[PDB]
């Protein structure tokens, strides 16, 4: 997969993934891979927006060759920033985030791994994954960039989690 004749190349190839699982629990598949801006729109403009997905569902957009699981070599020493959103906000947030990621707005060298939008029962969750959780200059820069590129509600909690780090929870 290479950019075509007069397309606009990207800094990396990326791969779209989709998953549907159950809470409390191979269920993750590749949708397609792109090498240019025009090719990205060719996938993305024909995809269901995360705000119209049903179930316990996620879209993942990752650098080609990185699997959206933490055990992956590029992910095992990393972490993610997490933003929890009310229903109605995820689709616009996901678009602004993937356009920022693709256009190289983060400026953190090779640290970015990919992004996930997670549809849950009563909230959506957007995350961005990076290589090195202990790299405070990188995670600080990622946090600030998210604030520059997303229109978030005031009061919005952002939270970093390293991957290695009453009744049962039934709905989510």
């Amino acid at each position: 997969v290479v950019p075509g004749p007069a397309e606009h190349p990207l800094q990396y190839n990326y791969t779209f993934w989709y998953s549907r699982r159950t809470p409390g629990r191979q269920n993750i598949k590749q949708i397609g891979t792109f090498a240019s801006v025009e090719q990205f729109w060719r996938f993305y403009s024909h995809m269901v927006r995360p705000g119209d997905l049903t179930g316990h569902s996620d879209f993942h957009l990752f650098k080609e060759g990185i699997k959206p699981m933490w055990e992956d070599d590029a992910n095992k020493n990393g972490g993610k920033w997490i933003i929890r959103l009310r229903k109605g906000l995820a689709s616009r947030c996901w678009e602004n985030l993937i356009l920022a990621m693709l256009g190289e707005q983060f400026m953190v060298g090779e640290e970015i791994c990919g992004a996930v939008v997670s549809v849950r029962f009563q909230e959506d969750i957007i995350s961005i994954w990076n290589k090195t959780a202990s790299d405070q200059a990188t995670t600080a820069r990622i946090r600030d960039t998210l604030r520059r590129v997303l229109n978030l509600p005031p009061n919005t909690i952002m939270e970093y989690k390293t991957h290695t780090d009453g009744p049962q929870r039934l709905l989510f």
Binding site: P9, V37, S45, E104
Partner: peptide
Amino acid sequence: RIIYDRKFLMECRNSP
């Protein structure tokens, strides 16, 4: 590094 502004990226959406 290959850097794209959001405006530019959006404008490409109308190019086949």
